[PDB]
Amino acid sequence: QFNIDATLEDVILINGTAYNAHTREEIRSPCLISRTVHKLTFQYTATEEP
Amino acid sequence: QFNIDATLEDVILINGTAYNAHTREEIRSPCLISRTVHKLTFQYTATEEP
């Protein structure tokens, strides 16, 4: 599970998909995530490389 | 429930007590809260004013 410490500031996801660490919201490949999330949960998806 | 965002950056609690909105972590008044918290849950406490 990817943590977001103070040094990471902001992160962006381009390829793959993501899920929230609190309510498990699905996230599209190209999209900004703002900062309301805490941790990033990856997944095994053979359709696209994250 | 107090929310956090980019405008308010960092916040500090001085008087009272607080509880995390994620894992119910109780915290006293004279300490920092780092950033791992996202929402602040107040409570009714007549012993001290928050």
What residues contact A38, with CB distance under 8 A and at least 6 apart? A4, A21, A22, B22, B36, B38
Mutate to test the interface with B, among A4, A36, A37, A39 (most CBs of B within 10 A): A36
- Cα gap A24→B39, rounded to integer Å: 17
Give the C-alpha distances (Å, rounded to integers) separating A6 from A22, A29, A37, B9. 20, 24, 14, 11
Resolution (angstroms) stands at: 3.2
At residue A27, what is the residue type? I
C-beta of residue B12 within 8 angstroms of C-beta of residue B2: no
What residues contact B22, with CB distance under 8 A and at least 6 apart? A22, A38, B36, B37, B38, B39
- Selecting from B5, B6, B38 the residue whose C-beta is nearest the C-beta of A38 gives B38
Method by which this entry was solved: cryo-EM
